[PDB]
């Protein structure tokens, strides 16, 4: 049986033209192998008000094997690498099923943003912070949502720490990474930034 | 009260319920028309996933809204 | 991995089956096409769902096992 | 930053890495120092065999940590 | 599951095939994708030249292994 990946993707696009803005898939170029997804941060989460971009690649065996999906937009979440955007989600691995679609995949991502599993993490540092300091995690995720995903607001006590550290001559993204990973303790963030 | 759920055949089905109905109710009615156990059923509405014990009144599901069905997922 | 699962050629006039579509390829069941019924009662193009079952033991809609 | 990679024989390798480096990037550095195809490298740390797509920071591997390097059937 | 097959040129080629697939399978199956006669074709994995009588399971070519082609 022939690889129906391009046909199956094209069929998914013709289906999504019948509906109602939570999610979207777009072509990146003339190549149906490579798509661009976007989800909205789910309400009542720190991602609320963010728009998260997804790099979607469709293997040629699709839909018999899952699409490869990654966060392009940076995000702070136990099951997504704060560095690469790599997602650990069972429907993108051992638990794919052929009846799934990109639509149901992105909805599933939205669901994951609201249902962290910190005990089996993609990002141990975020997972630890999620368990040890739930308040600090919520603020860190909202700040990442604001800085990187267009979310409305984030906490001024955290962004003041970013400003003082960047004034010393460190790049904001490096400052943000350092403070977030050191639980917003300026002393140890500064040491990480200074280290070579 | 008639609401819609877009199912795992990509299609939308029509459900007769009331706002008084639990999500467990809505999920059970969906296994009627589609063959997916409640266990594997997960209902998302407007980016919010729906927990069994609440009601379409709790979640504020009215008129002809669409819920979205997905297989259960687990971050790992 | 070779299943005696029920298989029947689709007939649009003798359509005693609930499903009209194969969710693996997302094309309708068409006349004279061989369909396959999994133990969970889900039906697909046999060519489709047989491919899926070569590498998976599970129903691609509801995840029910397709062997026991 | 520096991490250390220890083999079962006892030899420790020192690498310069960044927390941002993927495990695959790390295996690549082990090849550049020891000639070992990444195909054949298994890296273990804190009860976990590390996965190529995750980074050192993804595993919370900080400076001066020591990873275990176990090898594979080269013969076949 | 699926496994990779590195050219003589350098292009690394993807194949989804079954462990039951005999080595003779893979010579012609590879030839169909972009290849030339299988009789010229030679396959190496884990240091071993792969005999066209044996099969993928016999050499325990797992999911996501990489095969290398050379020419006789
Ligand atoms: C989900 C949670 C969990 O712990 N595991 C597997 C066990 N494991 C470790 O403890 C470290 C790496 C690893 O895979 C899950 O799948
Ligand atoms: Zn089909
Ligand atoms: Zn089924």
Author numbering:
A (entry chain B): 1 to 20, 25 to 200
B (entry chain C), D (entry chain D): 1 to 76
C (entry chain A): 392 to 459
E (entry chain E): 1 to 72
What does the study report here?
K48-linked polyUb chains target substrates for proteasomal degradation, but the mechanism of Ub chain synthesis remains elusive due to the transient nature of Ub handover. While in most cases only the Ub ligases (E3s) select substrates for Ub modification, for RING E3s, the ubiquitin-conjugating enzymes (E2s) govern how polyUb chains are constructed by defining the internal Ub–Ub linkages. We showed that the UBC active site region defines the selectivity for K48-linked Ub chain synthesis, while the UBA domain contributes to processive polyUb formation by orienting UbA at the active site and plays a role in recruitment to Ub-primed substrates.
K48 of UbA is also in close proximity (~3.6 Å) to D124 of UBE2K, suggesting a role for this residue in coordinating acceptor lysine. R54 of UbA forms hydrogen bonds with carbonyl oxygens of P125 and Q126 of UBE2K. The canonical Ub-binding surface centered on M172 and L198 of UBE2K contacts the I44 patch of the proximal Ub from the neighboring ASU. The neighboring distal Ub binds to UBE2K’s UBA α5-helix and the preceding loop (residues E167 and R176) via its I36 patch, an interaction that has not previously been reported.
